[PDB]
RNA sequence: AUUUUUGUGCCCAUCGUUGGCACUAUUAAGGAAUGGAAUAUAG
DNA sequence: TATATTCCATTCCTTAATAGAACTAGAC
DNA sequence: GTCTAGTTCTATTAAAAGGCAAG
């Protein structure tokens, strides 16, 4: 039920005197310089692990003893790392020598793991551990004793303790609790419980715990058995009984005995170290005197990569074993035949160097249809061969040869329409070995080659050091605190200063490197967001109460837009442009405080201070845990449909609904509350622009810009075409340009299209790349309407940034072209620093736009869910589970387009945001068929699927539209289930308009348009509906789109709704029964 | 402990009327793709 | 126009981690 | 009375009696 997350506030360090900042910088430098020593030492400790140390351990995660040892003994690290490198062929030999036995499959798989041979190499950590014993003059027996103790205390191994605990048990010189005393006491409790196994009241249990401890109170029990530290659960029962909060609790005697019996092991030893003094002396020599806070701070940074890579590498090895087991090695000979293509004459290469073959080279499992069509040709050629008896038998055979090449070429072109184009030579080659290999075996064999290569190429994770950051806080860390708001008011009063200010102060216990002693110091920070949502004080009496979600934000119910005073508004106007935005926010904050509109924030020592030093810059982050209790009793489901070009959508469904609109969904009464599109509106004067969909101003208002662009291309409109069947055709760019220069066209589309044309001009004038340099700057940077100056968050705007990056690549590539030394970023920067800076500026702006799009889309989804939660109750947000969208088997353009979907990034932001609000839950569901299901009818109780639809006038019809409708009437079979819906849709289209296949098949687009206009004119209809893949509309049984109009399709009455709105309802309904189980 | 000028960013033919907005930070690798130049091949 | 490779660059996502809790002797 | 710097804390995964006569 308990859920935990953190919210962070980034800040700007406001510097004090240089000497004060130097003291802090020197301390941060000291911790950073120190961290690598702990990293090296912990690697040596891991190297000393052996079968004796891990004897009788836990079950871990199906990790074998061999794997646990191998991951400790051998690691992949940078070649220039201090540990000496080992060859991969020696890992098993070294393992046998250290282990005494040869490695098992898990350790063997780890050794076989792929890695980049030019950056990383295997390292022997056992040799590193030998270096520790030698360098510190440590007894092998003494270090083994300490290592064994460390394993029990979780200082080393699979499940590590915190750095703070590890530092304390290993190096702490403070008074330790006597472990034997706790062992005798826990043992006595176990004995008494066994003696009275049938007790059932806490009163009886507390009495048994008290008798075991020879005491009459928890306080006397703790002093004798657990003097220092957090209260053990067994002593908490006595304390809670003395408080009176657990008197009615149930008692599970077998469970208490079992849990107590498991802790016994930890208390059979007193943790008497034998080499800690020597190791501490070595550490003091390298990082200075032992301090729990400083050593613990450095150890946490050193430990994180070592522990994390061990966890990740163990899972990866186990994953590889299953993936390898999943391979069918029995198909290797079939794979061997297919791989034979490289040796065959069909494949031809200078060095005849091969490549990996994947299913898309044969068109996946669509080779079978090609085989049947090819067998039929052969069958007819093997049945008409008997009726020959002529000298020219070399006619028919050539007709069989030549028609085999058209069938294959045709297959490759058809498949290449909606996927990667298959390889003609490989399929020709494969047809030649038709008696040699069955077609199903060709697929199994090609699959084996591809699947084997993918599994074998997966790389091991190298162990890389961490760039460190240090934590300051109230407890178990370096001492630090944010001055509290009350202390700030008191400090200001005592200083005869203004009651409020815009700065945040921290006090941290820091080491003075000169004296090597601790000193508390004060530092200043600035963060407007922190001040608004947390820090600024609600000084006025009877201020609004603190918000349920503690943060003071608009989503949490605080608008923060109070009426400003004339002196306040003049302060904003009076300030420079660079400070006006922050001044307005500060003035607005002061107004809400004065007007008593600012809600209270409940202060606590809840914010961690993280400091990271890069150069002379300090990055300070304030983060606080946010606690949430799950609310499983959902009243509303919010479905979200993620789209790429089209708008995203949401649909809300009330569960356990009663009333006029209730629908009975498989015994669950539900009501479709509402659906909508996600838009992010920004006000400009009196109009508003949706950041998500705006494509820019029409060219009508950018004539100077277009003419300026048109003038430059004219001087470089000259361009040839290598694709003209021999002699290239010198075509004209300007004809292409005028098409996109229409006054009606959007600026972003025009700008994106112009970059592509400019790329073509440059490709056609390679020797004159330098000439375009000035034009690119005005287009991308300097121009008033340049890409950098104006762009929305619409898909087209993102594509415009992508093409601009490509054009800069083309300018640079052509600029440095020559007929061996590769061209690097250093070369480009020296060649054109301004152009290179421009490419970086585009990258930085695009990343910022992407982050902004994820946050604004996430905000809209969370706001709607919060609105529904306040109205109805707990809300479950459902998103589509989208994965593995980009594939090598698809064309580059599809993968390129698919990259901007951003469904996962938005979903990840929603999941994090959802964790901050009670009554909100987020899950992902299978998106299968969500675009074709008829919501509230499908699965209630029959499967109901329908085609997507397009709506246009007869004039707007295109040849593609005509061909698409005929394609659905083909009646050729498909492995695509959606194909039937489009077929039924096309059948419905002919019936609804009183048509027949011959009215569309073999009819000119002109004839087709007039036929539809005549029907529509008789029916007094402006537009016609036709089934189209990715069609904007869906004919729904229910009114799920607010703007939907009723229509009678094939004698059935349906609502014409936006297809995406229908989809959001469908996403909400996937496995909806499971959400109310 | 006082700096008083800044947490990070998003949108706009008019960059202001107080213009309109939004947001968990960091470390490190891995996975899957894309762009550019050129090469080989192919009907 | 397709396939495939090499080299220089890039994006979007995933998965290992960090951002401790509760306590008391002893220092004020 | 307070505050800090030091300590230990959490999973669950236990064993064996019970079930049978005269002696």
Author numbering: 7 to 825, 834 to 1091
Question: What do the authors say?
Answer:
Cas12i is a newly identified member of the functionally diverse type V CRISPR-Cas effectors. Among them, Cas12i is characterized by a relatively smaller size (1033-1093aa) compared with Cas12a. Cas12i has substantially different efficiencies in cutting two strands of target DNA, which results in a nicking activity that could be utilized to develop a double-nicking approach for genome editing with high specificity. In Cas12i1, the REC lobe consists of the Helical-I domain and the PAM-interacting (PI) domain, whereas the NUC lobe comprises the Wedge (WED), Helical-II, RuvC, and Nuc domains.
The second ternary complex uses the wild-type Cas12i1 to form the R-loop complex after target DNA cleavage (hereafter termed the post-cleavage R-loop complex) and its crystal structure was determined at 2.45 Å resolution. In the post-cleavage R-loop complex, both NTD and TD strands are already cleaved by Cas12i1. The PAM-distal region of the target duplex is released, and the PAM-proximal region of the target duplex is retained in the complex. Interestingly, the cleaved NTD strand stretches out of Cas12i1 and is captured by the neighboring complex from another asymmetric unit. Correspondingly, the cleaved NTD strand of the neighboring complex is determined passing through the RuvC catalytic pocket of the post-cleavage R-loop complex. The overall conformation of the unpaired region dA(6*)–dA(13*) of the NTD strand from the neighboring complex extended into the post-cleavage R-loop complex resembles that of the unpaired region dC(11*)–dC(18*) of the NTD strand in the pre-cleavage R-loop complex. Hence, the post-cleavage R-loop complex not only represents a state of the R-loop complex after the cis-cleavage of the target duplex, but also provides additional information about the pre-cleavage state for the trans-cleavage. For some unknown reason, the cleaved NTD strand accommodated within the RuvC active site was not further trans-processed in the post-cleavage R-loop complex. Notably, three water molecules were identified to form multiple hydrogen bonds within the RuvC catalytic site. Among them, one water molecule interacts with residues D647, N649, D1074 and the phosphate group of dC(11*).
